[PDB]
Design a protein around this ligand. Structure first.
Ligand SMILES: Nc1ncnc2c1ncn2[C@@H]1O[C@H](CSCC[C@H](N)C(=O)O)[C@@H](O)[C@H]1O
Ligand SMILES: [Zn+2]
Ligand SMILES: [Zn+2]
Ligand SMILES: [Zn+2]
Ligand SMILES: [Zn+2]
Ligand SMILES: [Zn+2]
Length: 1169
């Protein structure tokens, strides 16, 4: 039941009609007014339709040609008194043609003007009847103005950034509101976005339009905003500091790579407008009257709907193709060449199949062992093959032979076309081949690092350019195509017996094949059916009888519909319609044996293991809840036994009876990896515990580290816990983060500056900044680490001219210059997972290329945070790099078991699948850290908690909490504070049930008094949705007119300040029913991502507390990041929330740091000959 004129509903919610004294209608402009078009003022005004409903003038009625009329008292134009005293009462004025904003007073009420066919009217004060309608329009205009000005200040701001801006914006006195809310924005989303759109349409360019800002795109999706229409209201109207080498790399890539589906919706008004003819695009058209070269669409015709989809495609990884099998050995046939004569030189160096090794041979050229040759493949896409002659011999069965150690072309590596076309890489591929297949002799230069490589940073590459090159092939690094690892060549030296035969590739492939074969070592005892053994080796690990052993969870087993829903009360409940594997089985080796075959000899092709089962607390009849308090390190002895294949073993661990230990369990557990302990045995049949049987008994200096983009220091904290690092310098432009870093690092020098500033000063010769802080110089920095934000270069679509310039001077380039200048021993670049996929993987490739050019060993990999002791699903791209003379670290094996869908660590670059050294595929020794492990001990607080220092009011309840609280006597609970969500949002949280899986779809449709004094009225369902149907009671489920086929959204169907957010059923069908929004965290679950600013309808996943009616606290977020409770944060609550969220979790950083410690130990304790 709506009006035929205005779209308003005749019955309800709060309609209103007009009231006149009454007096005259338009054309009586004679009383005082008579004295291009005339202009007057109009106070105590009211707008209405032909049926007399008070209508807003900003919902498109006028432009749909529905005649809106108005009344009020007219005044002389020079009058400033709004008081009626004073004026001539008019009626049925209009209909309204244009309406526009004449400006703002002070302030800041917008001053609107009308225009009839007769005169123009500048409005003053509205009639008491029309006051609320005019107040909303007043609210629309101001909010839209704030948004536009906000989006101009930053093109990267997210949805939660936008809300914060709105909430901190003081509403003008004209409106009797004392605060704006998220609801205020969603209320006027359509109008605001239209203003946002019209900002761009006026000012045409090539840069991204202001409405494609992330926060706007989410708003257009959350609220159901229709894009592409109207713009009438107007009345006219960070650059990288680089070294020469780094600059040259990205500059040359530009010059050599500069030049270059979806279509317009065709339905939006932008698409239905003719080509203007005033823009550069239309001026460059053959049809009157340009060249027609640009072929760009009309500047006033770019479809915003098409723009959104292109923005969506740009954020997508296209794609994670299933298989994508494993990279094949670079294989096929070669061309037998037709050389004239092949003769040996000198005579046989060695004699052995009667193989006679020679030293030199003639092909009209001369070849020695160590020379390099070219070989022609019979060719598919194949280029020339290059190899090093490692041996020359004449077989008495085969012909004249040589062994070829293959080089790999740079373009065939992960580097791709970014590689120097003449750079080669050593490779684990070699082959016996006949001399007849040699095409030619070839010169390959080994470009070793100079002996002062550590000091050549920043130098003009023209100075080191000498002499006369590059004209031929060269190499400097070994390459592993499975792991994309660039490493220094093996320094392995041949015996005097090996000299003219030695092949490093053959040697490495030999050691590889030996370790991968499970082999029995020492025999122990001989029995009739089997032979016992003392030891055995597998994957380079020595297993002896009595050792602890990892086994897959399937190695052995232990001895062990609601009532119906009131769909009127819960009208959105109908929209509600793999796990982490078990941690390793742990056993102690009782026997190593092989069955004897028919002949009586032991069969050592299958090695067996008799093992004593160990019970985790979860394996006990007590089941899962036993793990809640138990150490993650704890086991129970058992007298149960099992026989497994030695093939099944996954590694060796230490399982020690706790009492026998020479030290504390805490010290023991913290002493090294794979350390378990037990105190009691467990009897399954009696389901009880008892003392175990007595046959169950038995240095480096820290690296001086510079942390760029340090933040509050999550990454540095982890490295410090690893014992490998002392962060003496930190660079952080954002003051609160830098301040927090100082608090946790008293001995560090923190520069609250832009990273581009410092390096420029150091490269200028300065020793201190203006504040007098001693700058780090060459030799000081031993390790460089940093996690630069990706906002400058974070698209998946390929580079273009404009977008590359932004990357050309990005912080990645800045950070690489720090690495080039200081030349640290180790280098780590942390970033988001998609860093590896940005710009069709060009950001990664250019980063690796830059490191290789500098002479660094390097690799990359993706790590899941949850696999290292944290209740959170977040992946990170990690680029590792090591100086020449160092060992390139491996990526740490997962310590904790975790859901496999969150453990997709593989990487696709140019249709080449890349993988890290990680062998534990979602498997592991320790159980998953849950939300319960994370925060179950923290005392109850409320929405808007602000008490910075409180008491824990209890003892730690989990291993996780025990470790993070520390060993303090009476510790203070810091920053257990949370955001003061608005009245409406607070009421919504209170009505989200505690049952796991609960979200907004569980909200009741009821009237409740909000804490701001207002009433949240029930959501009214107004239309029938044939995609969802009616409820079982026969009620409508549609909420807008856009739910029917081909219908536009209906204004006045909009509802706000409701418990169930109107915008969620409005756009639910297009976005998986917004599953997760207003969702609670599960005790058994995890954080969906790094929370930086917790919003229920935000983009950071579920952020409601599992039980308490509030959003998660800063401490709780810090707990999810594995921060020690004693770690200090700085600033206001949002400053602290962002600090924690931006941080690399210390448990992850520590795991990485430990792999680095190994390399430090290797270089210090291992020497080569
Ligand atoms: N141009 C610039 N110079 C120095 N720091 C910058 C910068 N631009 C951004 N940053 C800072 O770099 C940080 C990246 S997030 C910090 C990383 C995280 N705290 C960790 O533990 O590793 C942000 O806090 C940001 O303030
Ligand atoms: Zn009407
Ligand atoms: Zn369109
Ligand atoms: Zn045009
Ligand atoms: Zn070989
Ligand atoms: Zn709609």
């Amino acid at each position: 039941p709506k009006c035929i004129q205005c779209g308003q509903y005749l019955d309800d919610p709060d309609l209103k009609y007009g009231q006149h004294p009454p007096d005259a209608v338009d054309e009586p402009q004679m009383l005082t007014n008579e004295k291009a078009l005339p202009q007057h003022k109009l106070t105590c005004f009211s707008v209405y339709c032909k049926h007399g409903h008070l209508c807003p003038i900003d919902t498109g009625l006028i432009e749909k040609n529905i005649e809106l009329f108005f009344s009020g008292s007219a005044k002389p134009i020079y009058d400033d008194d709004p008081s009626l005293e004073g004026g001539v009462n008019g009626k049925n004025l209009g209909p309204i043609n244009e309406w526009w904003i004449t400006g703002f007073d002070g302030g800041e009420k917008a001053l609107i003007g009308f225009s009839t066919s007769f005169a123009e009217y500048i409005l003053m004060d509205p009639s008491p009847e029309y006051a609320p309608i005019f107040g909303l329009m007043q609210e629309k205009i101001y909010i839209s103005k704030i948004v536009v000005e906000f989006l101009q200040s930053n093109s990267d701001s997210t949805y939660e950034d936008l809300i914060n801006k709105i909430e901190t914006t003081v509403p003008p006195s004209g409106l009797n509101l004392n605060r704006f809310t998220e609801d205020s924005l969603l209320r006027h989303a359509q109008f605001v976005v239209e203003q946002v759109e019209s900002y761009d349409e006026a000012g045409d360019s090539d840069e991204q339009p202001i409405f494609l800002t992330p926060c706007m795109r989410d708003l257009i999706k959350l609220a159901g905003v229709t894009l592409g229409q109207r713009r009438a209201q107007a009345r006219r109207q960070t650059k990288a500091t680089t070294t020469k080498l780094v600059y040259q790399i990205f500059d040359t890539f530009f010059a050599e790579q500069i030049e270059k589906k979806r279509r317009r919706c065709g339905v939006c008004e932008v698409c239905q407008q003719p080509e203007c003819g005033k823009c550069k695009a239309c001026k460059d058209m053959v049809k009157f009257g340009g060249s027609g070269r640009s072929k760009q669409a009309c500047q006033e015709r770019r479809c915003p709907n098409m723009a959104m989809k292109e923005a969506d495609d740009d954020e997508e990884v296209d794609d994670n193709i299933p298989e994508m099998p494993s990279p094949k050995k670079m294989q096929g046939k070669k061309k037998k060449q037709n050389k004239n004569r092949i003769s040996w030189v000198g005579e046989a160096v060695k004699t052995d199949k009667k193989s006679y090794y020679k030293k030199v041979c003639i092909d009209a050229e001369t070849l020695e062992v160590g020379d390099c040759v070219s070989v022609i493949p019979d060719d598919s896409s194949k280029p020339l093959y290059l190899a090093r002659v490692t041996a020359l011999w004449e077989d008495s069965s085969n012909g004249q032979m040589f062994h070829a150690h293959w080089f790999c072309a740079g373009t065939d590596t992960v580097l791709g076309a970014t590689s120097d076309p003449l750079e080669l890489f050593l490779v684990d591929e070699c082959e016996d081949m006949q001399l007849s297949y040699i095409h030619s002799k070839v010169k390959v230069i080994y470009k070793a690092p100079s002996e002062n490589w550590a000091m050549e940073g920043g130098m003009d590459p023209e100075s080191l350019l000498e002499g006369d090159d590059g004209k031929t092939y060269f190499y400097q690094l070994w390459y592993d195509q499975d792991y994309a690892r660039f490493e220094s060549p093996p320094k392995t030296q041949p015996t005097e017996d090996n000299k003219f035969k030695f092949c490093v590739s053959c040697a490495r492939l030999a050691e590889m094949r030996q370790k991968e074969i499970p082999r029995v070592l020492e025999q122990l005892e001989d029995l009739d059916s089997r032979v016992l053994y003392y030891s055995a080796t597998k994957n380079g690990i020595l297993y002896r009888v009595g050792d602890g052993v990892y086994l897959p969870p399937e190695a052995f087993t232990f001895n062990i519909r609601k009532e119906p829903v009131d769909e009127d009360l819960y009208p959105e409940h109908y929209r509600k319609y793999l796990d982490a594997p078990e941690p390793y089985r742990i056993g102690r080796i009782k026997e190593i044996f092989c069955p004897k075959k028919s002949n009586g000899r032991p069969n050592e092709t299958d090695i067996k293991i008799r093992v004593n089962k160990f019970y985790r607390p979860e394996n006990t009849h007590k089941s899962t809840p036993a793990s809640y308090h138990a150490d993650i390190n704890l086991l129970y002895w058992s007298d149960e036994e099992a026989v497994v294949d030695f093939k099944a073993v996954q590694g060796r661990c230490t399982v020690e009876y706790g009492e026998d230990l020479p030290e504390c369990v805490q010290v023991y557990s913290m002493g090294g990896p794979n350390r378990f302990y037990f105190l009691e045995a467990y009897n399954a049949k009696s389901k009880s515990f008892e003392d175990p049987p007595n046959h169950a008994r038995s240095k480096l200096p820290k690296l001086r580290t510079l942390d760029v983009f340090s933040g509050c220091g999550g990454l540095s904290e982890g490295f410090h816990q690893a014992g490998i690092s002392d962060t003496l310098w930190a660079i952080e432009m954002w003051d609160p983060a830098a301040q927090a870093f100082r608090l946790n690092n008293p001995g560090s020098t923190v520069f609250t500056e832009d990273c581009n500033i410092l390096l420029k000063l150091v490269m200028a010769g300065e020793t201190t900044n203006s504040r007098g802080q001693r700058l780090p110089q060459k030799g000081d920095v031993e390790m460089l680490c940093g996690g630069p934000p990706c906002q400058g270069f974070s698209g998946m679509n390929r580079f273009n001219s404009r977008t590359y310039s932004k990357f050309k001077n990005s912080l990645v380039v800045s950070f690489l210059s720090y690495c080039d200048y200081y030349r640290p021993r180790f280098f780590l670049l942390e970033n988001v997972r998609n860093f590896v996929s940005f710009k069709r993987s060009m950001v990664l490739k250019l980063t690796l290329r830059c490191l290789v050019r500098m002479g660094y060993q390097c690799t990359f990999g993706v790590l899941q945070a949850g696999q290292y002791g944290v209740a959170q699903t977040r992946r990170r791209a990690i680029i590792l790099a090591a100086a020449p003379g160092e060992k390139l670290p491996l990526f740490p094996e997962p310590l904790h078991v975790f859901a496999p869908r969150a453990c997709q660590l593989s990487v696709v670059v140019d249709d080449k699948k890349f993988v890290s050294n990680i062998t534990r595929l979602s498997s592991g020794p320790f159980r998953t850290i849950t939300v319960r492990d994370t925060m179950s001990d923290l005392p109850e607080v409320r929405n808007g908690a602000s008490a910075l220092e409180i008491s824990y009011n209890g003892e730690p309840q989990s291993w996780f909490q025990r470790q993070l609280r520390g060993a303090q006597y009476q510790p203070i609970l810091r920053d257990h504070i949370c955001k003061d969500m608005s009245a409406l949002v607070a009421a919504r949280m209170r009505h989200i049930p505690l049952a796991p899986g609960s979200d907004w779809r569980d909200l009741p449709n009821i009237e409740v008094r909000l804490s701001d004094g207002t009433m949240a009225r029930k959501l009214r369902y107004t239309h029938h949705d044939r995609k969802n149907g009616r409820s079982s009671s026969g009620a409508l489920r549609g909420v807008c007119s856009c739910v029917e086929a081909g219908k536009a959204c209906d204004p006045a169907a909009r509802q706000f300040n409701t418990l169930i957010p109107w915008c969620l059923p409005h756009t639910g069908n297009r976005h998986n029913h917004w599953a997760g929004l207003y969702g609670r965290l599960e005790w058994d679950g995890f954080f969906s991502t790094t929370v930086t600013n917790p919003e229920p309808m935000g983009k950071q996943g579920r952020v409601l507390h599992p039980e308490q009616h509030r959003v998660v606290s800063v401490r709780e977020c810090a707990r999810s990041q594995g921060f020690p409770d004693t770690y200090r944060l700085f600033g206001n609550i949002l400053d602290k929330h962002r600090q924690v969220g931006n941080a690399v979790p210390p448990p992850l950083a520590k795991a990485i740091g430990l792999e680095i410690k190994l390399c430090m130990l290797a270089k210090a304790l291992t020497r080569v000959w």
